[PDB]
């Protein structure tokens, strides 16, 4: 079988570089040659314990693109009046008798990992567990970088915004750090700096990174400008006002950008990316979202289908 057949997809730290490359290669194939009946007769649970419309639609679309059937729910409503007094363990023990795979998003860290201990031979795919992991986001990010840059090695990658609390940038950094010669530029206010443990991981690997106060300091040498939302609910509104300008992008900021440079953003971008960026050849956040379909198909295909995709 293929290396990922019947494996759980929980954390980027459990996927090797060969695993990542396999998912991306499979994604490229399906994009080029769709296989609308590959997962015919599979039933997949779309379990959004925490609601996330954008991520759920992406995942369920990917299921249907391979011909699978979908059952599911979306809570976030059930919370503390009772939520569900039933353990997650029991919920999974039940649901894993119904379906062929579980895709789940949950507000507590570790939830997907816990699921695997109760799902039997039913694979669990983590669609996000608290501030921990979100590997399918990282997989579509990587696929998008590889497609637009031709490689995942020797790149200049800038990450901007809330580097402190963004699970998505933590995970992308770990992922890119599995490849060689990548250089990072971290652009964040002090209250939102890339955490020390990420920097330490880079140090062990002998990977170069530098801190920068603004985007213009490095705009002329970056291949990927990866922007993130500033969880403004964390900051004082006056504090937000004062640092806002350093993590916002507009079209005029792009004058000296390389021709190959792409601007990514896991969305929503409401504050950080002006709409005049949208029609530059650098804007690639919507194409990025579109690649979620192919990355998520590849993962479902690899995990549910014994033989590799052609």
């Amino acid at each position: 079988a293929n290396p990922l057949y019947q494996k759980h997809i929980i954390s980027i730290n459990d996927l090797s570089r060969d695993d990542l490359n396999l998912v991306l290669a499979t994604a490229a194939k399906l994009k080029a040659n769709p296989q609308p009946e590959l997962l015919k007769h599979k039933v997949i649970a779309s379990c959004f314990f925490e609601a996330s419309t954008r991520t759920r639609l992406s995942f369920e679309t990917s299921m249907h693109r391979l011909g699978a059937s979908v059952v599911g729910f979306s809570d976030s409503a059930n919370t503390s009046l009772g939520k569900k007094g039933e353990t997650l363990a029991d919920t999974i023990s039940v649901i894993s008798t119904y379906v062929d795979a579980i895709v789940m998003r949950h507000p507590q860290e570790g939830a997907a990992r816990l699921a695997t201990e109760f799902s039997g031979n039913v694979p669990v795919l983590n669609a996000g567990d608290g501030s921990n992991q979100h590997p399918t986001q990282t997989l579509l990010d990587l696929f998008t970088i590889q497609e637009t840059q031709g490689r995942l090695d020797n790149l200049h990658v800038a990450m901007v915004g809330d580097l402190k609390y963004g699970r998505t940038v933590h995970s992308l950094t770990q992922a890119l750090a599995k490849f060689d010669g990548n250089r990072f530029y971290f652009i964040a206010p002090d209250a939102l700096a890339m955490p020390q443990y990420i920097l330490d991981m880079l140090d062990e690997k002998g990977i170069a990174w530098s801190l920068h106060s603004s985007i213009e300091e490095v705009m002329a040498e970056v291949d990927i400008l990866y922007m993130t939302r500033v969880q403004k609910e964390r900051l004082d509104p006056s504090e937000y006002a004062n640092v806002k300008a350093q993590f916002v992008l507009r079209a005029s900021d792009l004058h000296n950008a390389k021709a190959n440079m792409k601007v990514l953003h896991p969305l929503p971008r409401v504050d950080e990316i002006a709409t005049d960026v949208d029609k530059t050849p650098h804007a690639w956040y919507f194409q990025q979202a579109g690649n979620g379909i192919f990355a998520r198909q590849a993962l479902l295909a690899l995990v549910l289908n014994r033989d590799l995709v052609l």
Partner: protein, 144 residues
Amino acid sequence: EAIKRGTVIDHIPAQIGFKLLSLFKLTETDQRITIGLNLPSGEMGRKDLIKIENTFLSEDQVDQLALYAPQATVNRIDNYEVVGKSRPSLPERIDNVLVCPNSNCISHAEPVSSSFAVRKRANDIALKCKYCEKEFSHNVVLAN
């Protein structure tokens, strides 16, 4: 074309005359006005110019330009003669025109005019909102 009695704002940083007209509602009068942006500027590289007849600017009003044209020259004219030239100096308070950057400030959508204490710093000007008492760089306030 030249003027008999009134006020001439000269050496206005280019493309700014229009702004000055907006912010300070200078066109809200019946008096004759003459304007030039990016003009024949011997005395500059690129500058703007505004003429307003039968109207005069007090010291404070002149100072309110300091943030938008700190090297302008305001001319007071009567009987065709320039009777006085003054340069904008940094005011201690700026009202009406600026918007507090704090989105939680009471000033937004309430029937009051904005108001900021002004104080010069090395490399910028600090502006402190009368209402929320938060202080911002003029670059932050002026941004929006």
